[PDB]
Design a protein around this nucleic acid. Structure first.
Ligand code: MG
Ligand code: MG
Ligand code: MG
Ligand code: MG
Ligand code: MG
Ligand code: MG
Lengths: 57, 96, 159
RNA sequence: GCAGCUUGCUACCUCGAUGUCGGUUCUUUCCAUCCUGGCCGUGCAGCAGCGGCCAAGGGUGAGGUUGUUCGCCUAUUAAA
RNA sequence: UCCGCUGGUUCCUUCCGAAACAUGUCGCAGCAUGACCUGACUUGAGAUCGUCGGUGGAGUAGAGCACUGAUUGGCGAUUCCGGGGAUCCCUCGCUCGCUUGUCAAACUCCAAACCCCCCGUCAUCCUAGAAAGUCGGAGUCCGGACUGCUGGGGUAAGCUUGUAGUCCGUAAGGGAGACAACCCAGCCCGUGGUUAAGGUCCCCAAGUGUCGACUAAGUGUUAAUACUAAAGGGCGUCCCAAGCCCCAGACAGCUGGAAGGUUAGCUUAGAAGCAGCUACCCUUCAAAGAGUGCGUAACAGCUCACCAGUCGAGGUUUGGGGCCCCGAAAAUUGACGGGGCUCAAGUCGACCACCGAUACCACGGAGUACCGCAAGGUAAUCUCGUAGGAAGGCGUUG
């Protein structure tokens, strides 16, 4: 269930990076959980949270 | 009050490009047109005579006839037809 | 007059000297500060703007004075090179009848800005970086817009 | 920045009429606290001051000039 | 009497349906001519509200200094036109060039996206009559609002004056608490069905719905909006990144150490580390100082900085974000629509099911437009309506 997520999101007026580890039953749900967590934490939508890789860990 | 003469608001309309000022090419003055031949109005500021009203700048008319050294055009303004006299120095053919 | 009277950008620019008349002078005397002849400061930070507005020249003068005092007090007289950038080219007019011929007359001068456009710039050594930040933070307090500080050159040195 | 308690700006309502200023009588509301209640600081020994915070329960008067509001002055008063 | 000024002007249905603008006017509460609406007739084949490609017009946004005006310092010279104090003893601003930092509505070496004329093509309309023309009848020249143009003016305004589109005027019905012009929808009558906007704890039809987080303030529970508070701060809490020290041992404490010299220079007696020059007061040992403070005429120790033994796992500096808190005071009693609501009935990112119009679908019916000798035929491309134009009918007395 462990997973690795990498990508970049638009924090304010600049681009950052992240390496969040999300627990989930599979990989598509890991991507969905990443999107939802970023929406909760930073108010962004599914257009500024570009996920480069969701490689299993 | 604003004036309403015949040359109003033509600061840039009646100007010449920087590498265009002086004597214009002379071959443009001897071009000859026939009946029903679409032409473009492009006023050359260097020539003072035979100039249509600059409101017809950039319009396309068709030749109707000749009166001396000036052709009679048929330009549409709005929904009317206006007959405009212009020497061939200000005109320019349409490339089909 | 109050500061917010002439701070928004709602109308066209009005800056041609030869057409208007009787523009009052300015107070800001020198636009370069400190060691002009030096060119070997490795750190170059600056104060930027977060929103479009108009800054009166008096506000710029006050900010310059306060930054000068702080920097000279802490860093030293030869340890920095401050340089204001925006010059006030705009002109401010105040009506003074009612709305009958309400067009105003010249009362002052202002300098328009743009978002993320640098206003001040300070160069220092490595040991006086915190003093430079401390100086630039007070100067932005007299300024009519939100302001943030960006370290342009030598970011790896300080960070 | 707040209030709308001074003067301005506008012309949205009222010209087949919404009876003006000041005073008098009587009732009520706000707090941005003059006194009364409780606290904190002081370049607060005591007495008395200076500055700030909570608090609208009660009090906030009598007279000379002036149509005056406003304002000046008089003797009291916890404060007027 | 007269008025360009105020009030009134009587039956039904059907077809179509505006302008609140320009010019002239002793013109501004009026009128004429034109645009816009309507009825009839003539003629007889094209028209362009839209797409694509091309020949042309750009001088606005943006951008920039090459002209015109401004504008910031450094450098090199104007051996001038210039101000400072007998070889003008020599200082030297204005000015001319190279480099740095800003501008322009009446600047442009540049330069879009919209937009306009014409040609070709597609597409729609059209012999049931395109374009054009002739004649009859008018209303109208107090407008207003929303979304764009950083529109112009103004401190601002539910202010004033422009412009493109669409609306109210003259627009039902559904939803917004109520709402002229905000969202869905442009409407003949009757029945059934499914949806739009918007909603689903109760008022109130349909979710005490699902997944992942945030808020502790009753903050919030308010598409747009004339109805919603700012700068500044927060070691409040939730995240990302970057440096630095680190179990052979980092931070907070437990401890003592901070001893060599000095009582530093100091005139007042005295400001002896803490008024006033200096410098690491030790060659040297963790520590040892010109050194903060309780003390302190001066000190002095107590000891600051600054390291050392000690525990025994993470610590610390900065930048960028989400929500919330302070900043935050008004007059009758009270407004998330109300009750109330806290792993929510709030906020953020997604998702599922259902409710809900006269919209869309089906059936029946009326009227209208056009055609047809009639019977009848076609209508997704017909059914809102104020000023107003036109057609057919009802009634009263003779
Ligand atoms: Mg521009
Ligand atoms: Mg009229
Ligand atoms: Mg609208
Ligand atoms: Mg309408
Ligand atoms: Mg309605
Ligand atoms: Mg009618």
């Amino acid at each position: 269930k462990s997973f690795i997520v990498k990508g970049k999101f638009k924090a304010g007026s600049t681009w950052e990076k992240f390496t969040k580890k999300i627990e989930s039953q599979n990989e598509k749900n890991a991507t969905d959980k990443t999107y939802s967590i970023f929406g909760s934490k930073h108010g962004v939508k599914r257009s500024q949270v570009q996920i480069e890789s969701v490689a299993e860990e | 009050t604003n004036s309403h003469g015949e040359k109003r608001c033509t600061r840039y309309k009646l100007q010449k490009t920087v590498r265009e000022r002086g004597i214009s090419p002379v071959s443009r003055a001897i071009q000859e047109f026939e009946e029903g031949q679409m032409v473009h109005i492009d006023i050359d500021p260097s020539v003072q005579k035979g100039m249509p009203n600059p409101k017809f700048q950039g319009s396309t008319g068709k030749v109707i006839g000749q009166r001396g050294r000036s052709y009679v055009l048929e330009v549409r303004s709005g929904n009317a037809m206006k007959e405009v006299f212009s020497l061939p120095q200000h005109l320019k053919p349409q490339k089909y | 007059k109050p500061g917010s009277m002439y701070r928004n950008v709602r109308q066209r620019s009005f800056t041609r000297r030869k057409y208007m008349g009787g523009v009052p002078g300015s107070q800001v005397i020198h636009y370069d500060m400190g060691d002009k002849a030096n060119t070997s400061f490795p750190v170059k930070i600056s104060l930027i703007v977060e929103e479009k507005c108009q800054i009166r020249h008096t506000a710029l003068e006050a900010a310059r004075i306060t930054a000068n005092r702080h920097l000279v007090a802490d860093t030293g007289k030869m340890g920095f090179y401050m340089k204001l950038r925006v010059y006030p080219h705009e002109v401010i007019r105040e009506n003074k009848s009612g709305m009958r011929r309400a067009f105003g007359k010249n009362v002052g001068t202002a300098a328009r800005v743009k978002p993320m456009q640098k206003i001040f710039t300070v160069a220092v050594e490595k040991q006086n970086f915190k003093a430079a930040k401390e100086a630039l933070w007070h100067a932005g307090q007299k300024l009519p817009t939100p302001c943030r500080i960006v370290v342009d050159e030598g970011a790896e040195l300080v960070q």
